[PDB]
Amino acid sequence: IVGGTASVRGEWPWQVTLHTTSPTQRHLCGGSIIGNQWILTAAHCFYGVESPKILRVYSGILNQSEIKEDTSFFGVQEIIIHDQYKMAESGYDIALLKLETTVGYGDSQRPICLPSKGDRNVIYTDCWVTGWGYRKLRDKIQNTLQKAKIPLVTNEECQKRYRGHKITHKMICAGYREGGKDACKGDSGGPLSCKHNEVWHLVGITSWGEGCAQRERPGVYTNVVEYVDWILEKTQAV
Numbered sequence: 570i571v572g573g574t575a576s577v578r579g580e581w582p583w584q585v586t587l588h589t590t591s592p593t594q595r596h597l598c599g600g601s602i603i604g605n606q607w608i609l610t611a612a613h614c615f616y617g618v619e620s621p622k623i624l625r626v627y628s629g630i631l632n633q634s635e636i637k638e639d640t641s642f643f644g645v646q647e648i649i650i651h652d653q654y655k656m657a658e659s660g661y662d663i664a665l666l667k668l669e670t671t672v673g674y675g676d677s678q679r680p681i682c683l684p685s686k687g688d689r690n691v692i693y694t695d696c697w698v699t700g701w702g703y704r705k706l707r708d709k710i711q712n713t714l715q716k717a718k719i720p721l722v723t724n725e726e727c728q729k730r731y732r733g734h735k736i737t738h739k740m741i742c743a744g745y746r747e748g749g750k751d752a753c754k755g756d757s758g759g760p761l762s763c764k765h766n767e768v769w770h771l772v773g774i775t776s777w778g779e780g781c782a783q784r785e786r787p788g789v790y791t792n793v794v795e796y797v798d799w800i801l802e803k804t805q806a807v
């Protein structure tokens with residue numbers, strides 16, 4: 570996260586850190602708890618991941634230093650990538666992780682509500698991006714989970730900012746015109762969380778951008794409201 574500040578423990582209890590153990594264990598991506606065996610994240614995270622056996626999901630984490638060999642984690646039973654996904658810049662950048670065991674909810678880890686289909690017309694004014702990503706292009710994964718408040722940008726304005734790309738309504742953009750606050754490397758897959766009527770909703774999934782927090786280059790997020798039927802199809806299968 571560029572231009573952000575340290576989060577407080579328990580502030581974003583749906584935020585997870587997804588680690589890969591291959592070749593050595595390290596943070597790979599962010600994700601959000603959406604159900605007791607379900608993590609919503611970005612499809613591009615899994616480039617070259619040949620098996621869910623190499624993945625570890627850690628919840629209830631504020632600091633990456635809390636993770637050692639003896640730290641409990643959730644194994645991944647299945648990786649479900651949207652079958653229209655080709656690359657982050659073309660959309661459908663969404664994936665579900667089906668966990669091997671059930672997440673016990675509490676004050677350190679709980680799910681975030683998905684947006685309502687009726688709320689496709691609501692104007693969100695209190696949106697935050699969170700993650701352990703870089704603070705600039707050439708940096709390193711941060712120990713403490715960071716947060717940044719960022720305004721949503723209309724599809725028309727985002728399209729003007731990304732000449733040469735096709736910004737669809739399945740994408741949602743966020744960022745200040747002058748730049749300064751954004752997601753960066755290591756934040757992808759994490760949530761863009763918006764508070765509306767005192768309830769937090771998972772509005773976006775951190776996906777891509779041209780550089781980090783540059784002027785007139787907002788971050789591009791998967792527009793979660795457009796995928797609620799897909800998520801229910803995969804998580805509520807008979």
Ligand SMILES: COC(=O)Nc1ccc(-c2[nH]c([C@H](Cc3ccccc3)NC(=O)/C=C/c3cc(Cl)ccc3-n3cnnn3)nc2Cl)cc1
Pocket residue numbers: 595596597598613614615616702709710751752753754755756757758775776777778779780781782787788789790
């Ligand atoms: C010790 O462990 C590590 O160092 N882990 C570690 C883990 C992941 C990374 C890492 N993650 C990423 C991903 C794409 C990826 C994922 C998975 C695998 C490989 C590529 N993009 C991101 O997060 C974020 C991209 C991004 C998003 C928005 Cl909304 C706006 C601007 C963005 N940007 C433009 N330019 N930048 N952002 N790149 C790097 Cl490098 C580094 C380091």
